[PDB]
Design a protein around this ligand. Structure first.
Ligand SMILES: O=c1cc(O)n([C@@H]2O[C@H](COP(=O)(O)O)[C@@H](O)[C@H]2O)c(=O)[nH]1
Ligand SMILES: O=c1cc(O)n([C@@H]2O[C@H](COP(=O)(O)O)[C@@H](O)[C@H]2O)c(=O)[nH]1
Ligand SMILES: [Cl-]
Ligand SMILES: [Cl-]
Ligand SMILES: [Cl-]
Ligand SMILES: [Mg+2]
Lengths: 220, 220
């Protein structure tokens, strides 16, 4: 009972121009039915971009908003985001359980899903997030979180996060390609990989996506 | 050399419809010249609301976006935010130094300021953020950050943050009113207080703002 991500591949659409974002997403549509839309695109083009993607493509939308406020503000952010048509939203765990619970409550009420971001993929994540991440994950499990995000760039950490959340939980993982993570190795632990620049900056994004999929063909 | 906030009072405009947000801000305009605009309003009404506030009120705009992504994405968020006319942006320190530096770089390029959020005001902040907060503040100092955010709801923690950053740094503080923080006590340590619901949900927002100011009149 998890979202059925085509080819285990989620596009991180972080182009900031509507025309370019629409073109590239359209070009890879035969390979990907799940698109992660974040603030680079939303702050450049408006929340109506979610509407436009739904209209143009047959794609699920994950709003990567890394929600990280107090409970009252988190509730408002989630409400606005789901109102706009996002299927799911990504929330930070480091602000604590009440902040996460606020998002879960709105998602339950509105019939949508929360993804909990545990450890991040960039070097700075080692300073504070890494040391909290196992506990953030355990907190997620205690709160009944079913969907998680963890880092492709640290296979040992991604493996531990998978252990904590169990095989039944859904885990997606960014940092593949540009940040150095390997698609096949990441899919040992994650249900789906998130890929941005490797696809959207390619001369031929469709060929780039098809190439990633070919490399993981035996894992589909 | 620091931001000059009228009446040491920053309005947290978290109403989610344009008409109400503009009306209430108009009602209190004689008391403030600095407005914090966050995702509740921006995700509901669009980034164009920032220019509209500048057109109507001439106020400074702090974009409270809790920026908490990897460096590459942080750059794009800051660029989109400053393009919309924000004077400053609030950035989480928890994701580490590289993520903060990404924001500082864009702010310098566009003539804007970064505010570093150290400890948060809500109960969940105790789980992970609080234990990292002094180190996050020292990181800010090392990075040359001059503007900080810390919690009205824990004056002893707010005082410690002031100690770390020094008297020359600029410190603003939310959690006043609704979350239990006291305006005058908070201004012992913060340069300015952030106030949302105690004003914008009041029967008479102007009288609410006037009342807060009366209570701190000997601190102005
Ligand atoms: O830990 C994380 C969490 C993320 O959401 N992301 C997001 O995943 C995407 C990665 O894109 P890319 O493949 O271009 O590196 C970006 O949208 C980024 O904001 C990440 O890189 N690391
Ligand atoms: O630690 C923090 C950091 C914040 O930015 N905030 C923000 O400050 C505002 C507080 O508003 P209020 O006065 O209604 O509690 C909200 O916009 C909230 O998102 C906070 O409450 N605590
Ligand atoms: Cl709250
Ligand atoms: Cl770093
Ligand atoms: Cl909590
Ligand atoms: Mg007083």
């Amino acid at each position: 009972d998890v979202m059925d991500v085509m080819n285990r591949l989620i596009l991180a659409m972080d182009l900031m121009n509507r025309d370019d974002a629409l073109r590239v997403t359209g070009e890879v549509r035969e390979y990907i039915d799940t698109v992660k839309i974040g603030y680079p695109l939303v702050l450049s083009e408006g929340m109506d971009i979610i509407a436009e993607f739904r209209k143009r493509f047959g794609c699920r939308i994950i709003a990567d908003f890394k929600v990280a406020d107090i409970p009252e503000t988190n509730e408002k952010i989630c409400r606005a985001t789901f109102k706009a048509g996002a299927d799911a939203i990504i929330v930070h765990g480091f602000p604590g359980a009440d902040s996460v619970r606020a998002c879960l409550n709105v998602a339950e009420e509105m019939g949508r899903e929360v993804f909990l971001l545990t450890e991040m993929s960039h070097p700075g994540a080692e300073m504070f997030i890494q040391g909290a991440a196992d506990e953030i994950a355990r907190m997620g499990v205690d709160l009944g979180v079913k969907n998680y995000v963890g880092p492709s760039t640290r296979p040992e950490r991604l493996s531990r996060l998978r252990e904590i959340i169990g095989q039944d939980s859904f885990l997606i993982s960014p940092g593949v390609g540009a940040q150095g993570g390997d698609p096949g190795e990441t899919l040992r632990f994650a249900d789906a990989i998130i890929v941005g620049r490797s696809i959207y900056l390619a001369d031929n994004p469709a060929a780039a996506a098809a190439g990633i999929i070919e490399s993981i063909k035996d894992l589909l």
